[model samples]
Target: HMTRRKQEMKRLKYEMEKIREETEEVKKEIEESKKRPQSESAKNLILIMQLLINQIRLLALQIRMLALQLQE
Candidate 1:
């Protein structure tokens, strides 16, 4: 069955969470380093990172809901 797909989702969830948490930590460094805020470029990069993290969270929720639907 497509339980394999579920397995993939599980692993991806782990990676997504890991990346999200790690990127947040990086944010603190950028903001705190020398007590100067990031330049526009660095800010954009972090914005994009947060965007992906949000996308991943939405995706994971959808995946989980679909799996629940399938178990019907």
Candidate 2:
């Protein structure tokens, strides 16, 4: 039981790290998009923004679950 819990914690931590990295990448993309000449595909900035927001919400939920387990 203890080992399983430890592994679960580690997995959750790894997932959180991935989400963090992706979020940073998206942020950089948003910044770079500003330098490019205005174009239709550039409108994807909105989609990327929404995706980042959703990813953050998901990461928050996962972290909450991890915290709850720690309370056990």
Candidate 3:
């Protein structure tokens, strides 16, 4: 086991990758959803996808920064 900011993010990274897989499946849903006239639900779904990606991006950055600091 490692200290704080060391091991916890790895699980998060795992889950983020899982989320990405689901999101890829959601891509098909999104395409079919676009065929519909409703914008509200699709917009919300898109927002969730955006938010997920943003957090995942930030988490990777944090991990990289922590690794850099850990190595020093």
Candidate 4:
């Protein structure tokens, strides 16, 4: 039903915001790590975090699109 879809859309939006905040924290950690001597493990962690942020961004965009469609 439309009400269910609206609820799902709201939940997705909240999740998207939480992910965005997490991504920002990760970015800050990455910056802090750069100030110290970097190791292979650190580099790998940064890469993984970047990938996670990218995926989150994509998911957020997709959810926004779907929510918009539901509006129409």
Candidate 5:
């Protein structure tokens, strides 16, 4: 029974090593993803431009409203 337990322990250690290696690989991929922020910046710029366009549209609407009021 002692020999069987020792064999089981060795197998468990090997499995843990394999898991540690896979965890390291996943960590590396996460690091690479963190460095890739250009796509995020592009999305932000598009959002900002849309906001500016919306502001312009609002100003145009106000101008039209004022013109109609002046006609009164």
Candidate 6:
């Protein structure tokens, strides 16, 4: 049981790391977008992407906290 939990935790950690990398790429895209003119819809799309990234970060943190609690 414990072994399975550990394995799952490792997988979650890997996913969180991938999300972090994606967030960085999105941030770069946002910066690049600012250098050029964008339509209102395009701006909203970027905002939505940022919101999704924020949620991903929050979920990752929650998973990490849960994993820590399981360790005790």
Q: Evaluated with TM-score, which candidate comes out highest?
A: 6
Candidate 6 lDDT tens digits, 4-51: 878887888887788888888988888698667889999888778778
* Candidate 4: residue 70 lDDT (0-100): 75
Candidate 4 has an lDDT of: 0.81
Candidate 2: regions farther than 4 A off: 37-44, 47-51, 54-58, 61-65, 68-72
lDDT tens digits, residue span 1-72, model 4: 878878877888887888888888877887687667878998787778778878888887888887788777
How are the candidates ranked when ordered by TM-score, highest leading?
6, 4, 2, 1, 5, 3
Candidate 3 deviant stretches above 4 angstroms: 1-38
lDDT to native, each model: 0.67, 0.73, 0.67, 0.81, 0.58, 0.82
List candidate 4 stretches off by more than 4 Å.
1-8
**TM-score between candidate 5 and the true structure:** 0.50
Each candidate's TM vs. the true structure?
A: 0.52, 0.57, 0.47, 0.69, 0.50, 0.74
Each model's number of backbone clashes?
0, 0, 0, 0, 0, 0
lDDT, candidate 1, 1-72, per-residue tens: 488876776676667667667766766665565256778887777677667656866776776576567656
Clashing pairs in 3: none
Q: Which candidate, 1 or 3, would have the higher TM-score against the true structure?
A: 1
Report how far off residue 15 is in candidate 5 (Å). Answer: 0.4
Score candidate 5 by lDDT.
Answer: 0.58
- Lowest-sum lDDT 10-residue window in model 1: 27-36
Number of clashes in model 4? Answer: 0
Candidate 6 whole-model C-alpha lDDT, 0 to 1: 0.82
